[PDB]
Protein backbone atom coordinates (compact mmCIF):
# COMPACT_ATOMS: atom_id res chain seq x y z
CA UNK A 1 0.00 0.00 0.00
CA UNK A 2 0.80 3.95 -0.79
CA UNK A 3 -1.96 5.75 -1.26
CA UNK A 4 -3.79 3.55 1.12
CA UNK A 5 -1.14 3.96 4.27
CA UNK A 6 -1.78 7.82 4.05
CA UNK A 7 -5.30 7.77 3.63
CA UNK A 8 -6.21 5.14 5.00
CA UNK A 9 -4.35 6.89 8.08
CA UNK A 10 -5.92 10.24 6.48
CA UNK A 11 -9.41 9.31 6.95
CA UNK A 12 -9.42 9.29 10.84
CA UNK A 13 -7.78 12.03 10.83
CA UNK A 14 -9.50 14.05 9.20
CA UNK A 15 -12.74 12.29 11.10
CA UNK A 16 -10.14 12.75 14.12
CA UNK A 17 -11.02 16.71 13.74
CA UNK A 18 -14.81 15.64 13.57
CA UNK A 19 -14.24 13.83 17.44
CA UNK A 20 -12.06 16.88 18.12
CA UNK A 21 -14.17 19.88 18.07
CA UNK A 22 -11.85 22.77 19.78
CA UNK A 23 -9.79 25.37 19.36
CA UNK A 24 -11.69 26.62 16.61
CA UNK A 25 -14.55 29.30 15.73
CA UNK A 26 -17.52 29.39 13.79
CA UNK A 27 -16.74 31.72 11.06
CA UNK A 28 -19.81 30.82 9.02
CA UNK A 29 -23.02 29.82 10.41
CA UNK A 30 -26.77 29.63 8.82
CA UNK A 31 -29.46 27.93 10.45
CA UNK A 32 -28.35 24.11 10.06
CA UNK A 33 -24.86 24.77 9.07
CA UNK A 34 -21.42 25.77 11.31
CA UNK A 35 -18.04 26.13 9.63
CA UNK A 36 -15.51 26.70 12.14
CA UNK A 37 -11.96 27.86 11.88
CA UNK A 38 -9.34 25.96 13.83
CA UNK A 39 -5.64 25.55 12.32
CA UNK A 40 -4.35 23.89 8.84
CA UNK A 41 -1.15 23.34 10.70
CA UNK A 42 0.09 21.59 6.94
CA UNK A 43 -0.43 25.37 5.99
CA UNK A 44 0.23 28.74 7.48
CA UNK A 45 -3.16 29.31 8.05
CA UNK A 46 -6.36 27.65 9.68
CA UNK A 47 -8.42 24.92 8.51
CA UNK A 48 -12.26 25.07 7.89
CA UNK A 49 -14.82 22.69 9.37
CA UNK A 50 -18.51 22.83 8.36
CA UNK A 51 -21.53 21.14 10.17
CA UNK A 52 -24.67 20.62 8.60
CA UNK A 53 -27.81 17.92 9.23
CA UNK A 54 -29.35 17.11 6.47
CA UNK A 55 -32.48 15.33 6.77
CA UNK A 56 -31.68 12.14 4.86
CA UNK A 57 -30.01 8.98 4.87
CA UNK A 58 -25.78 8.77 5.26
CA UNK A 59 -26.56 6.55 2.33
CA UNK A 60 -27.88 8.96 -0.89
CA UNK A 61 -25.46 11.90 1.17
CA UNK A 62 -22.73 9.18 -0.19
CA UNK A 63 -24.99 8.51 -3.42
CA UNK A 64 -24.00 12.15 -4.60
CA UNK A 65 -21.09 13.20 -3.59
CA UNK A 66 -19.65 9.59 -4.62
CA UNK A 67 -17.25 10.24 -6.99
CA UNK A 68 -18.08 11.08 -10.71
CA UNK A 69 -21.32 9.96 -11.64
CA UNK A 70 -24.13 13.12 -10.73
CA UNK A 71 -21.58 15.46 -7.76
CA UNK A 72 -19.75 17.12 -10.87
CA UNK A 73 -23.07 17.43 -13.18
CA UNK A 74 -25.91 18.92 -10.82
CA UNK A 75 -23.42 20.84 -8.24
CA UNK A 76 -22.78 24.47 -8.15
CA UNK A 77 -18.75 24.86 -7.37
CA UNK A 78 -17.76 21.48 -9.53
CA UNK A 79 -16.97 20.90 -13.07
CA UNK A 80 -15.69 17.50 -14.24
CA UNK A 81 -14.17 14.74 -12.64
CA UNK A 82 -12.04 12.52 -14.22
CA UNK A 83 -10.80 9.11 -12.44
CA UNK A 84 -6.91 8.86 -12.93
CA UNK A 85 -5.44 6.59 -10.49
CA UNK A 86 -7.76 4.58 -8.26
CA UNK A 87 -5.30 2.26 -5.94
CA UNK A 88 -8.28 -0.30 -4.87
CA UNK A 89 -12.26 -0.16 -5.03
CA UNK A 90 -12.31 2.75 -1.97
CA UNK A 91 -9.16 4.52 -2.85
CA UNK A 92 -9.57 6.58 -5.52
CA UNK A 93 -7.62 9.92 -7.13
CA UNK A 94 -9.36 12.54 -8.53
CA UNK A 95 -8.49 14.89 -11.04
CA UNK A 96 -11.92 17.84 -10.27
CA UNK A 97 -11.86 20.92 -12.06
CA UNK A 98 -14.04 22.83 -9.69
CA UNK A 99 -15.46 26.68 -9.88
CA UNK A 100 -14.11 27.61 -6.20
CA UNK A 101 -14.07 30.99 -7.97
CA UNK A 102 -15.01 34.16 -5.00
CA UNK A 103 -16.68 35.99 -7.62
CA UNK A 104 -13.57 37.30 -9.25
CA UNK A 105 -10.20 36.90 -7.05
CA UNK A 106 -10.10 33.30 -7.67
CA UNK A 107 -9.92 31.46 -11.09
CA UNK A 108 -11.07 27.96 -11.23
CA UNK A 109 -9.11 25.24 -9.75
CA UNK A 110 -7.75 21.28 -10.69
CA UNK A 111 -8.23 19.57 -7.38
CA UNK A 112 -6.28 16.11 -7.92
CA UNK A 113 -7.19 14.66 -4.55
CA UNK A 114 -6.28 11.22 -3.29
CA UNK A 115 -9.67 9.93 -1.88
CA UNK A 116 -10.26 6.86 0.22
CA UNK A 117 -14.05 6.27 1.41
CA UNK A 118 -14.45 5.22 4.61
CA UNK A 119 -17.57 3.12 6.39
CA UNK A 120 -17.59 3.06 10.38
CA UNK A 121 -20.05 0.74 10.97
CA UNK A 122 -23.13 3.35 11.34
CA UNK A 123 -21.09 6.23 12.74
CA UNK A 124 -19.91 7.58 9.04
CA UNK A 125 -19.78 7.35 5.45
CA UNK A 126 -16.89 9.52 5.08
CA UNK A 127 -14.41 10.25 1.90
CA UNK A 128 -11.16 11.50 2.61
CA UNK A 129 -8.97 13.33 0.52
CA UNK A 130 -6.16 14.37 -0.03
CA UNK A 131 -4.10 17.02 -2.52
CA UNK A 132 -1.68 14.13 -3.98
CA UNK A 133 1.50 14.71 -5.73
CA UNK A 134 1.18 12.23 -7.91
CA UNK A 135 2.35 11.73 -11.69
CA UNK A 136 -0.85 10.59 -13.30
CA UNK A 137 -1.91 14.36 -13.40
CA UNK A 138 -0.08 17.75 -13.79
CA UNK A 139 -2.27 20.52 -13.62
CA UNK A 140 -1.66 23.65 -15.65
CA UNK A 141 -1.67 27.62 -14.94
CA UNK A 142 -5.51 27.72 -16.57
CA UNK A 143 -6.45 25.62 -13.52
CA UNK A 144 -4.32 25.47 -10.18
CA UNK A 145 -4.49 21.84 -8.51
CA UNK A 146 -5.46 23.01 -5.10
CA UNK A 147 -3.55 22.01 -2.64
CA UNK A 148 -6.21 20.65 -0.27
CA UNK A 149 -4.25 18.83 2.32
CA UNK A 150 -5.10 15.60 4.04
CA UNK A 151 -8.96 16.43 4.12
CA UNK A 152 -11.99 15.19 3.71
CA UNK A 153 -15.42 14.76 3.78
CA UNK A 154 -17.90 12.74 6.77
CA UNK A 155 -21.46 11.85 6.17
CA UNK A 156 -22.46 11.00 9.87
CA UNK A 157 -25.75 8.82 11.07
CA UNK A 158 -27.47 11.20 13.33
CA UNK A 159 -30.02 10.24 16.37
CA UNK A 160 -32.21 9.70 13.68
CA UNK A 161 -29.95 7.65 11.41
CA UNK A 162 -31.87 7.36 8.39
CA UNK A 163 -33.67 9.96 8.97
CA UNK A 164 -31.29 12.86 9.71
CA UNK A 165 -27.35 12.61 9.00
CA UNK A 166 -24.38 15.04 9.97
CA UNK A 167 -22.38 16.05 7.44
CA UNK A 168 -19.59 17.18 8.01
CA UNK A 169 -16.35 18.42 6.22
CA UNK A 170 -13.26 19.79 6.63
CA UNK A 171 -10.54 21.61 4.72
CA UNK A 172 -7.44 22.98 5.50
CA UNK A 173 -6.40 24.20 1.93
CA UNK A 174 -3.18 26.34 0.71
CA UNK A 175 -4.78 28.38 -1.78
CA UNK A 176 -1.37 28.80 -3.25
CA UNK A 177 -2.67 31.21 -6.28
CA UNK A 178 -2.76 35.12 -5.65
CA UNK A 179 -5.43 35.94 -2.85
CA UNK A 180 -5.86 37.75 0.20
CA UNK A 181 -7.01 37.17 3.39
CA UNK A 182 -9.93 38.33 3.19
CA UNK A 183 -10.48 36.47 -0.32
CA UNK A 184 -9.96 33.07 1.37
CA UNK A 185 -12.16 33.76 4.29
CA UNK A 186 -14.84 34.12 1.57
CA UNK A 187 -13.23 30.99 -0.32
CA UNK A 188 -13.06 28.38 2.47
CA UNK A 189 -16.36 29.32 4.60
CA UNK A 190 -18.76 30.03 1.68
CA UNK A 191 -17.75 27.22 -0.13
CA UNK A 192 -18.20 24.13 2.63
CA UNK A 193 -21.29 25.63 2.89
CA UNK A 194 -21.77 25.51 -0.37
CA UNK A 195 -20.42 21.37 -0.59
CA UNK A 196 -23.39 21.17 1.89
CA UNK A 197 -25.63 22.71 -0.43
CA UNK A 198 -25.09 20.77 -2.99
CA UNK A 199 -25.66 18.06 -0.80
CA UNK A 200 -29.40 19.44 0.34
CA UNK A 201 -30.09 20.36 -3.40
CA UNK A 202 -28.26 17.00 -4.55
CA UNK A 203 -29.92 14.91 -2.02
CA UNK A 204 -33.17 15.89 -3.19
CA UNK A 205 -32.27 16.13 -6.53
CA UNK A 206 -31.39 12.52 -5.99
CA UNK A 207 -34.76 12.37 -3.55
CA UNK A 208 -37.25 14.81 -5.21
CA UNK A 209 -38.35 14.67 -8.87
CA UNK A 210 -35.79 17.78 -9.28
CA UNK A 211 -34.03 16.24 -12.13
CA UNK A 212 -36.37 18.45 -14.33
CA UNK A 213 -33.60 20.84 -14.51
CA UNK A 214 -31.44 17.86 -15.93
CA UNK A 215 -27.69 20.07 -15.79
CA UNK A 216 -24.70 18.06 -17.67
CA UNK A 217 -25.13 14.52 -18.17
CA UNK A 218 -24.21 13.13 -14.86
CA UNK A 219 -23.02 9.78 -16.25
CA UNK A 220 -21.85 11.17 -19.35
Same mark, same amino acid.
Given at each position: *??????? @?? #??????????? /???????????????????????????????????? &?????????? @?????? /?????????????????? #??????? /? @??????? $? &????????????????? *????????????????? %??????????????? %?? *??????????????? /??????? %?? %?????????????? $?????????????????????????
Amino acid at each position: *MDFKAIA @QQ #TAQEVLGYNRD /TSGWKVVKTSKKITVSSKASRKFHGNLYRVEGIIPE &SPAKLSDFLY @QTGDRI /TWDKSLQVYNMVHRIDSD #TFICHTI /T @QSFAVGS $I &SPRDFIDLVYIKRYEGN *MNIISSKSVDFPEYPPS %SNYIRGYNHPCGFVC %SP *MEENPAYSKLVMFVQ /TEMRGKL %SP %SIIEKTMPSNLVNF $ILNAKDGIKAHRTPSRRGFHHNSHS
